[PDB]
Amino acid sequence: SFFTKLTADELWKGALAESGAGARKGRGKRTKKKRRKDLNRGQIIGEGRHGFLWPGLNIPLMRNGAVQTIAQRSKEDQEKVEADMVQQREEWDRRRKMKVKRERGWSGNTWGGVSLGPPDPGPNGETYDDFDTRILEVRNVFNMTAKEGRKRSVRVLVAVGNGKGAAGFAIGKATERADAFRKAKNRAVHYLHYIERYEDHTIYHDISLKFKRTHIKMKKQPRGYGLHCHRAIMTICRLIGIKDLYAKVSGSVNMLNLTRGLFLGLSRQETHQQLADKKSLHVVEFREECGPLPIVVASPQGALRKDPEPEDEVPDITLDWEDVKAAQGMKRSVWSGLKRAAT
Amino acid sequence: TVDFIKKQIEEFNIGKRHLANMMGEDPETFTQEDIDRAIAYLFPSGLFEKRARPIMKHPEEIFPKQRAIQWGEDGRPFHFLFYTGKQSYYSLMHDTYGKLLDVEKHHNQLRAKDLLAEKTKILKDPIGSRWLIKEELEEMLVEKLSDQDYAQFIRLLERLSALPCGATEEDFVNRFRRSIPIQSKKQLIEPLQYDEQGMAFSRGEGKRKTAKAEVVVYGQGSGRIDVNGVDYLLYFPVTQDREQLMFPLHFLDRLGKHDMTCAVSGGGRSAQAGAVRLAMARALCSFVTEDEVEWMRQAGLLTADPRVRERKKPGQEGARRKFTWKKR
Amino acid sequence: FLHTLNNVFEPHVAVRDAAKMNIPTVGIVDTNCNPALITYPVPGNDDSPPAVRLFCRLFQVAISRAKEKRRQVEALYRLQG
């Protein structure tokens, strides 16, 4: 029955059954990963159960200048050699069950907040080791096809940043999740924004914007209290470099709109120097802990206007009801003042 | 890949020297045709694909034409149309259009001076001139083209060629001209043969539907045909079969002016009758003037019949008929 | 850009793409063009043949002088040391 035997690749290609019709449209819900074991991982050409020492294969051909001859092995010696092989195989099994504990994202199973390392180098040889990327949203996308039917595709939305004020985002979609990450990282560095940071810890002024159907409001904060924002905003803020911010999200909480709305609002930020130039007047910062000391932070380069600003007795500004309610001390929710973990 | 080509060139010359040394010929005249017959002998590869046989030729002819480097060390492109995607095609278009303006400008000056010294040389019908094929043109510009681009380029040449032609322009145009082979349907008239005091006898070959006929016609005898040593009337009882033999002779009005002996083997009665008919038509071309030979072709006498019995496909009752198809 | 519009009266793709690649553009803009993305717009006429020829010649001498005066200073630099 020697002719009845087959090749190792043929046997494993059939035993695994990873090419049939079961694994096409989710028909196979086994959920247990069948593992293929290479039976040639441990090989000693010449070694056998009977224990024959063939000169040339296992034992050296020449011993002390004399060529060895064919010889057998002692029963006790052969037992020890066989005991060595089985322990090696048991060790291999122990090194396969264990799995590397990946970085903990926003949760234990989602990919939100998981870093993928530095982006791939550009075609010109430029290397980006300072940039870091984070995953914001992974979602399976299905499409209806004439032949296959449900064509499952994976799209991801990642953001990159160096921590010095430059960051960007992009979306990458492919048939495989592994290929999806690669496309998202490379296309991210092509779209980069520069977000001005007042003293490299906070935005210059409070920002209120409405991107499509997403209402996001951000407020300036001192150095002590920082990074109290949406868990997706915190991921972007750490990449940009902002370390003190408060943000409240109202309306739709879609990840794509929130990311676009945040960058659009931050890219529209106005600095003190620009405000001084367009007004031709000095801007004075009144620190509360420094008393009534008039610290000057920016000066209008060029002509200085001698005409003071017209003082309006009652300013005409649009106030948000949430801001006034909190200021007067009427927000008594059981979630606003809760103690949380570190930033 | 310039260096790789250079390495192939030098070792091919060295390899040619070794082949000449082992073949025992003169290495100075070891031509490519000699190399092909030498390789076909040392390595007798039996394969039906003509391109799959072992080859050893000039690396320039083997390796496809490669694009040269388009920019210097500083990155500046050498040509001024490199940013158009297809520099070679558009440069040719730019030069071709520029020649048209120069011809128009030159013709305008000639009209001002009241002189017309140019003539239309587009008509090259006796030579058999045809424009470049798209595949041939792509191998001249070393760049891929499209059907829309090819048609535009050819039509532009027609405008250039329809204008008065200059000496420089014709040299430019003639690079885009190709000559077709000689086209003719005249047959080769076999000269008459004389043998052992026999005058005006010719031999013809005919074959139709697995039946080969050998007919030799004597121009000095009366009207009779001897097939396989027996009279044609006995050998062809069917009226239709004997009508086939009449068809060549009757068309030439020489039914009784030729004595023939025939030898036909294989096939049925009609296959032999058709084969003998074809052989006589080819054999009688020697005795007939050239003008009526053309008339012979127009009647279908000289054209062999390509209709042969087809095979039987596996899974079918016959050559085309299939088994009964029960829908349910 | 001697003409910022294509043959279908739409803004040229190169105008938008150049801004993406951060490439400054000097283009002649007609009365129906969009000078928003062009960093050095030149409001003028791009249809009459005399206008088009004038712009080409002006950029011919501007380039030639730049090429020549680059060479003249290089010659002076070579004899400096």
Binding site: - | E243, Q244, M246, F247, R297, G300, L301, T303, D305, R307 | -
Partner: protein
């Protein structure tokens, strides 16, 4: 089809080539036939330049053939023309002075004339409209009328003939019957005219 699109139908008539100088346009037709170097198909076995053949006879001979017996079909057609000739010769002898130069003794003339009287003038084709079929008369083309006349001749002599009477003699009788406008085939032709005339108001259904 082993013949490509370039191949054309050969010309067989010898007289077409022997007198070309009396016309100019026809000269341009065949001088360019070979000047264009167009290939010519092989001569068919059935057709020949013999002056004693006739195209209508070959088509009629082919239809009578069953299976692949061309010799038997040719033999039957030969006897049928002979059978008609014998009957016409016999009737000529037993005739008066004025009757002698009335009878036609040419079987080819009789055969050509017989078919030209059995051809229907207007045919019928079913048309589906409103879930029902209406027999709508149509002006059948010449080739269809010529083909239909031959089929009626073959169908009549094959079906309602006696077992003893031979095929060549039975067909000979019908040719004479059709030559006098009194054969059953002529009756069948009139019957098709009866149905076509009755449905004369349904001709508006057809759209061609």
């Amino acid at each position: 089809s082993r013949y490509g699109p370039e191949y054309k139908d050969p010309q067989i008539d010898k007289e077409y080539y022997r007198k070309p100088l009396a016309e100019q346009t026809e000269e341009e037709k065949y001088e360019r036939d070979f000047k264009k170097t167009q290939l010519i198909k092989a001569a068919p076995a059935t057709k020949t330049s013999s002056v004693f053949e006739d195209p209508v006879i070959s088509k009629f001979t082919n239809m009578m053939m069953k299976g692949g017996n061309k010799v038997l079909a040719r033999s039957l057609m030969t006897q049928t023309l002979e059978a008609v000739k014998r009957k016409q010769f016999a009737k000529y002898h037993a005739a008066s002075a004025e009757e002698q130069a009335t009878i036609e003794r040419n079987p080819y003339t009789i055969f050509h004339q017989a078919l030209k009287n059995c051809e229907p003038v207007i045919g019928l084709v079913p048309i589906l409209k409103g879930g029902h079929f209406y027999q709508v008369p149509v002006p059948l083309a010449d080739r269809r009328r010529r083909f239909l006349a031959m089929k009626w001749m073959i169908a009549e002599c094959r079906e309602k003939k006696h077992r003893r009477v031979l095929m060549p003699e039975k067909l000979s009788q019908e040719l004479l019957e059709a030559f006098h406008n009194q054969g059953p085939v002529i009756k069948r032709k009139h019957d098709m005219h009866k149905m076509a005339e009755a449905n004369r108001a349904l001709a508006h259904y057809r759209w061609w």
